[PDB]
Every structure is written in C-alpha cells, then in structure tokens.
C-alpha cells in the first residue's frame, strides 16, 4: 500500500526504524572514485552544498509522477499532525535528506516539474542533517497507519506523597472528560498561549 524511500549519505542513521521502507545511500549515484556529493557554494559562504547532478540522478531512478517528495529544511513550512494524516494516504513518499548547507535549490525546482514537492521544517531549531527529521516525520505517519490497522497515571494510587487525582478513581466518564479538558486548557494557556489566538 505505501512505499517510503529515504535518500541519505548516512543510511545507518535509519536503522532505529503494508509499508515498504527503503533506505538508499546517495553515493550510489556518484560516478567518481571519491563518491563526491558536495561542492563549494556560488556567492561564497561557509560550508558545502549537495550537487544537483547527483540528486537529480537519484530522484530520476527513485521518484515518479505519483511521488510526494519531502525535502526536510529549516526554511520549510512546519510539519504538523494535519500533514502526517494527509501523508498517511500517500502511495509513495520520498525523503531527500540534506547534509552540509543543504541541497542545490534546482533539485527541488526540477523535481516539481513532474511530481509534488513539499519543503518541510520539523521545528524552529537547526539540525546537522535531514536524517533525524525524516525519522520524526516517518514515525508520525507510521503511527497513524498502525492505528488504522493531559497527564497520565497508573498504580500505585499514592507514590512519594503524590496522589492520583480523585476524579480519575471516581469511575465517572463525564467528570473525567471535563477534568482532562480543564487541565489541557490550563496547560495551553501557560505553555502555548498563541494556540488560543
């Protein structure tokens, strides 16, 4: 039903992880003895940029017109639960994992001529590579596929002088739902006030 390809210069990074998950070494698409995937940026600046000649060949082999190409980037639109649910209905996801200063922008523009491309950030922080971001996104999608085939407490009722809220022991499904909504609302006001506009 779903195929997921991950392209990276660090295939061992996805070892931690109906669904056919494949991980590809980007160096398989290099033609030199040094298996070179990067080169100096135009306009100067530190670091190296991943070459379009290498990425172009990798995507020519792996992706088709039906593919949804995900490019992790700290400059992309934010990944969220609505995106994970939408991507869980896809037949083919491809994750182009960037390293160094990222992939040559023309790779994305060229892919977008035949397939759908989404440049996505997992959050407002900087990772050294796109591998952990692909892992995070694949986990959120796979979690939804597994499911479609507030604070938590368990025993003991009292621990280190801290008791489970009495409402959770009441057996009253309505009062429990009302309490969980109140704690959720209080947490949102304190931690994420922007979610209440």
Ligand X SMILES: Nc1ncnc2c1ncn2[C@@H]1O[C@H](CSCC[C@H](N)C(=O)O)[C@@H](O)[C@H]1O
Annotated binding site: 98, 122-127
Report if residue 73 touches its own copies, rule: CB under 8 A.
yes
Residue 68's binding partner among its own copies, ligand X, none (Cβ under 5 to 8 angstroms by kind) is none
The answer to whether residue 79 forms part of the interface with its own copies (CB under 8 A) is: yes
What, of ligand X, its own copies, none, does residue 72 touch, CB below 5 to 8 Å by kind? ligand X
Residue 168 within binding range of its own copies, rule CB under 8 A? yes
CA-wise closest residue to 100 among 1, 173, 194, 10: 10
Backbone angles phi, psi at 48, to 5 degrees: -110, 165
- Alpha-carbon distance of 178 to 157, in angstroms, equals 21
33 or 124: whose CB is closer to ligand X?
124
Residues 38 to 67 in contact with its own copies, rule: CB under 8 A: 38-44, 48-53, 56
End-to-end CA distance of the chain: 39
| Cβ closest to ligand X, residue 61 vs residue 139 | 139
Task: Based on the shown chain and the rule CB under 8 A, indicate whether residue 25 belongs to the binding site for its own copies.
Answer: no
Cβ closest to ligand X, residue 65 vs residue 126: 126
CA distance 71 to 191: 29
* CB 97 within 8 Å of CB 131: yes
Residues in the interface with its own copies (CB under 8 A) total 79
User: Which residue among 19, 89, 169, 178 contacts its own copies (CB under 8 A)?
Assistant: 169
Pattern of binders to its own copies over 137-166, x per CB under 8 A? --xx-xx--x---xxxxxxxx-xx-x-x--
DSSP 14: G
Q: For residue 13, what are the CA distances in angstroms to 16, 71, 129, 145? A: 7, 17, 10, 22
Q: Binding site residues for S-adenosyl-L-methionine, as ranges? A: 98, 122-127
Q: Which two tokens stand for residue 46?
A: 């530190």
């Amino acid at each position: 039903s779903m195929r997921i390809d991950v392209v990276t210069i660090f295939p061992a990074y996805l070892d931690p992880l109906l669904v056919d998950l494949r991980v590809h070494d980007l160096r398989r698409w290099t033609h030199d003895a040094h298996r070179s995937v990067d080169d100096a940026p135009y306009g100067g600046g530190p670091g190296m940029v991943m070459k379009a000649p290498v990425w172009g060949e990798a995507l020519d082999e792996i992706a088709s017109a039906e593919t949804l190409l995900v490019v992790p980037t700290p400059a992309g639109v934010l990944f969220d639960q609505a995106t994970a649910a939408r991507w869980s209905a896809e037949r083919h996801l491809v994750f182009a994992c960037g390293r160094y200063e990222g992939i040559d922008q023309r790779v994305v523009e060229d892919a977008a001529r035949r397939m759908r491309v989404e440049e996505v950030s997992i959050g407002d922080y900087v990772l050294p590579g796109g591998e952990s971001a692909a892992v995070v996104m694949i986990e959120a999608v796979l979690r939804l596929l597994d499911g479609v085939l507030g604070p938590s407490y368990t025993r003991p009722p009292s621990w280190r002088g801290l008791d489970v809220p009495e409402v959770l022991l009441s057996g009253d499904h309505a009062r429990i739902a009302a309490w969980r909504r109140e704690v959720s609302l209080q947490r949102t006001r304190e931690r994420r006030p922007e979610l209440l506009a």
